[PDB]
Paper text:
Aerolysin is a major contributor to the pathogenicity of Aeromonas spp, which causes gastroenteritis, deep wound infections and sepsis in humans. It is a pore-forming toxin (PFT), which is secreted by the bacterium as a water-soluble protein, binds receptors on their target cell membrane and, following proteolytic activation, forms circular heptameric oligomers that insert into the plasma membrane thus permeabilizing it, potentially leading to cell death. Aerolysin belongs to the family of β-PFTs, meaning that the final pore spans the membrane in the form of a β-barrel and defines the aerolysin-like family of proteins that share a common structural motif3. Combined, these structures, consistent with the recent lysenin pore structure, describe the major steps involved in the pore-formation process by aerolysin: the transition from the monomer to the oligomer with the formation of two highly stable concentric β-barrels, the zipper-like formation of the β-barrel and the final piston-like puncturing of the lipid bilayer.
Residue numbers in the entry:
A (entry chain H), B (entry chain N): 1 to 237, 261 to 424
C (entry chain E): 107 to 159
D (entry chain E): 319 to 371
The structure:
C-alpha cells in the first residue's frame, strides 16, 4: 500500500467502518509498522479495531493482533502530509573575514542559538539555558576555542534543581563551503622564500629546410617515504618461523618540460628551473556554509527520546552535520525516514518527541535550524614548502641550414 | 547584530536611554565581547547600565551581568569606523644591487627605523633608543650580519635606569620579491664548466615515397639517494621480535629527446648530448619587497601588551612578517581581527595599546611601517652542478627510396 | 576511602599550594567535605559540588 | 586538577593571573625533577635554581 505517518493515526469509538470524514480503516499491511510502535497509544488491557476482521491487543496480551471485531476502530485520514522539513527560506549574512563570518552566525540570537537550544530541550537534555530565568535555552553565553565555539550560559548566582550547574553545551565544530561556481576571485600569487632544487639549460637546432616537431626535454623530481612494520616468531616467546609485514609507502612527484617547435633553419635556447618554498594567495568568494553541531551531556531523566531512555541519567554526547549529507545518524533530515516504517532507527524516537512537543512545533523550528547560510568569505591563503618553477623558450637565432 | 570596536564604547551618566548624539545603548548580544574585556573601564564595585533591563557588575561581583537598571548607561555611536590600517601610500626606492637596495631600506631614518622603533615602545619593550637622549627609538645604530641586519643604538657613555645597556634590537631577517609580471629581463646565459655525462648519435631513413612521422629517440639520466632507518627489538634491552622503519628516498631525473620528421626519400643525422656543471645568468627586474622583522628582548615591566604581563620582567622575543600573509601571529594586519570579538588572541592585547598610546597614534604609524616597498633589483644568478645539454637534427641527405 | 591519614593531609597540600577550593557543606580548609569515586583505573576525590555557595 | 585560587605555585614561574594548572606528582623513588617534590624541596634552599614553585 503506502506507509503511514504514525502521528496521523486516530482511534475512534464508532464501532466499525470509517471515521471522521476521510479516515479510512487501517489494514493488515500497516499492522507491521503499527506493531509495537502504536502500543504507546493504549492501555495494558486496551484492545482495538484494527479493521478488516482484526483486533489489536495491548501489552496484557503480549502485543498480539488477532481476528475478530471491537468498537474502537483505528482510522487514517487518507490524505498526503508534509513528511519533511518545510522550505528553508534563506539566510543573508554580510561579507567579511571567514572567522568574522563565523562570529555573525554564532551570535545571531533568535535566528540561530534560540531554536537550536529549543531542540536541545525537545531532544531530551537537562540544563538548557543560562542562570537567568525559566525559559528554555535563553541567555546562553558564548566563548571560543581556536578550533570551535562554545555556547554555554553563565554558571553563577542563582542555581537549583537536580545538580547545580553542570550545564549542557552547544559546540560549533568544523564547517565547509559550497563554493558556488558563479563566483570566485583568485587574487595575486606569490612565494615567500627561495630554495633551489635543480635546473637544466640547453638548446636545440634545426639543420633542415623544414620546421620540426618537438624537442622534448623533461626535468623531474621525486620524493618518497617508507613505512616498515614486521613481526616475527621464533621459539614461542623455532626452526619453523613466521614473518609478516604491513606496509607501505607514499610518494610525491613533480615534472615539467618543454615541447618547443623550432622554426626552420634556427637555434632555440631552453631553460627549466625548479625551486621549493612557501606560497600565498588571497581569496575572495561567496559560498553556502556547511555547519557541524556538537551537543554535550547530560540527559533529562524521564524525558529522553534516545532509545536507551528506560534507564540511567546523564552524559550522552552526540554530533550532527548541518547540510546535504547522508552520514547516517548525523543527518537530521535523514532521520525523518525512521519516523515512519522501521524499528531500525539507530538513534532516537522522533515520534516520542512529536507527542511530547507537537509536530508543527518542531516542524517549524527544525527549518529555523537547518536553513542555508549564504555568505561572502574574505581573507587569504598560505602554505609551507610547496613547489615552484618556471619554463622558458628563448628567442631564435637565425643560423642553421 | 554587528561586532563593536571596543574603544568606541562610552559610559554616560544619563540615567537610561541613548547617549551623545548617535550613541545607541549596548545590547545583550554585545555583552559576550563586553564580558571580561570591558572590566578595565570600571572599578571593583562599579556597576553599569548595560541597557534593555540589564546591569553589568564589576570585579566585586565576580564580573556577572544581571537584570535591573542603573544610571551609568553604556552606549555606542552607531557609526562605522576605520577598522583597518589606512592606505599604504607607497615607497619609491631607486634601482640598485639587491643588497644595495637592502641598505637603502634599512637606512631610511624617519621613514623606516623611526615608526618601527616607535612601535617597539608602544608594543612594550624597555630600552628602545641609543645612548643619546630621551626620545623613543632615536639614534639607533646599524650593523650587519651576512644573513641579516641589526638595529641597535650605541652602548657607551651615558647610561641609567634599570639595567645599564641590555638594549633591545630590531633585526632584519629574510625577505622576498613580488616579481611583478609587467617586467623581467632575462640576461645572457652561460655555463662555467664542463663534464660529459653521456651522449648518443644515430640516424634514421625514409625508404618510402611518403613523409613519415616521429623517429623517437630518448636519452635519459637518473640519480637517487636512499635513507634507511630501522629499529629492532629482541630480548628487552626474544623469539617474538619487532622491526620498524622510516624511509625514504629522493630522486632527480633528466630526459631529452628528438621527435624528428624525415622528409620522403631521405637520411637524417641525429645527436643528443648531456653534460653537467655550473650555470649563470644576470637578472634584472622590479618587484615589491617583502620584509621580515625580528624583535629581541627585553620587556618593559608594567607596560606590556602581551597577555602574560601580570608577571616576570624580561626576554620576550618575537618575529613578524611584513607583507600579505596569514601566518598567524606574524601578521600585524591579521591581528586587528582580535581587537574586537574573541578573547582568543594568541598574542597581545591591542586594546591595551590603544588606551595607552591613542588609536590614531598607532593607526598612522602602522601604515608607516607596513606600506609597500617598490624597487628595482639589479644583479645576477649562479648555481653549482646543474644539468645542461643539446639536441640537433642535421641536414638531410637525398638518398633512400 | 580512609582519607583521615591521606586526604586530610593531601587536601592541605592543595590549599597550602594555593588551589581554589571550598567544601559543599563546610567552611573549613581541610577536605572534610568530600568522597571517593572512581574511573576504574584509578580513583577520584571531590567535595560534593552540591548545595549553594 | 582545577583552578589556582589567586596566589600559590606548584610548578610555575609565578606570580600569575586566574587560570588552571593540571599537573602531577610522583610519590615514590622515581627521581624526576618535574614531579619529585622532595628533590625540588631539597634544591631551592641551595641556589634558588627554580622560581617560587
Amino acid at each position: 500500500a503506502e506507509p503511514v505517518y504514525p502521528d496521523q493515526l486516530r482511534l475512534f469509538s464508532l464501532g466499525q467502518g470509517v471515521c471522521g470524514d476521510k479516515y479510512r480503516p487501517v489494514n493488515r499491511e500497516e499492522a507491521q509498522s503499527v506493531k509495537s510502535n502504536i502500543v504507546g497509544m493504549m492501555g495494558q488491557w486496551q484492545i482495538s479495531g484494527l479493521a478488516n476482521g482484526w483486533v489489536i491487543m495491548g501489552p496484557g496480551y503480549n502485543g498480539e493482533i488477532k481476528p475478530g471485531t471491537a468498537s474502537n476502530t483505528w482510522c487514517y485520514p487518507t490524505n498526503p502530509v508534509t513528511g519533511e522539513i518545510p522550505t528553508l527560506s534563506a539566510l543573508d549574512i554580510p561579507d567579511g573575514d571567514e572567522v568574522d563570518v563565523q562570529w555573525r552566525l554564532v551570535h545571531d540570537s533568535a535566528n540561530f542559538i534560540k531554536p537550536t537550544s529549543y531542540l536541545a530541550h525537545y531532544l531530551g537534555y537537562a540544563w538548557v539555558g543560562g542562570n537567568h530565568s525559566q525559559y528554555v535555552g535563553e541567555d546562553m553565553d558564548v566563548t571560543r576555542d581556536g578550533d570551535g565555539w562554545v555556547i554555554r550560559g553563565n554558571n553563577d548566582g542563582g542555581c537549583d534543581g537536580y545538580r547545580c550547574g553542570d550545564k549542557t553545551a552547544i559546540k560549533v565544530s568544523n564547517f565547509a563551503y559550497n563554493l558556488d561556481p558563479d563566483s570566485f576571485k583568485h587574487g595575486d600569487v606569490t612565494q615567500s622564500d627561495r630554495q633551489l632544487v635543480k635546473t637544466v639549460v640547453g638548446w636545440a637546432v634545426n639543420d633542415s629546410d623544414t620546421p620540426q616537431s618537438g624537442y622534448d626535454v623533461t626535468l623531474r623530481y621525486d620524493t618518497a617515504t617508507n613505512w616498515s612494520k614486521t613481526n616475527t616468531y621464533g621459539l614461542s616467546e623455532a626452526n619453523q618461523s613466521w614473518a609478516s609485514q604491513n606496509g607501505g609507502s607514499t610518494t610525491t612527484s613533480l615534472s615539467q618540460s618543454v615541447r618547443p617547435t623550432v622554426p626552420a633553419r634556427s637555434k632555440i635556447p631552453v631553460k627549466i628551473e625548479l625551486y621549493k618554498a612557501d606560497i600565498s594567495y588571497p581569496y575572495e568568494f561567496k559560498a553556502d556554509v556547511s555547519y557541524d553541531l556538537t551537543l554535550s551531556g547530560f540527559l533529562r531523566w524521564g524525558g529522553n527520546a534516545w532509545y536507551t531512555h528506560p534507564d540511567n541519567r546523564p552524559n550522552w554526547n552526540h554530533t550532527f552535520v548541518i547540510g546535504p549529507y547522508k552520514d547516517k545518524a548525523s543527518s537530521i533530515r535523514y532521520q525523518w525516514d525512521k519516523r515512519y516504517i522501521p524499528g531500525e532507527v539507530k538513534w532516537w524516537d522522533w515520534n516520542w518527541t512529536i507527542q511530547q512537543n507537537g509536530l508543527s512545533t518542531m516542524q517549524n523550528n527544525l527549518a529555523r535550524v537547518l536553513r542555508p547560510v549564504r555568505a561572502g568569505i574574505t581573507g587569504d591563503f598560505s602554505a609551507e614548502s610547496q613547489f615552484a618553477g618556471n619554463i622558458e623558450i628563448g628567442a631564435p637565432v637565425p643560423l642553421a641550414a
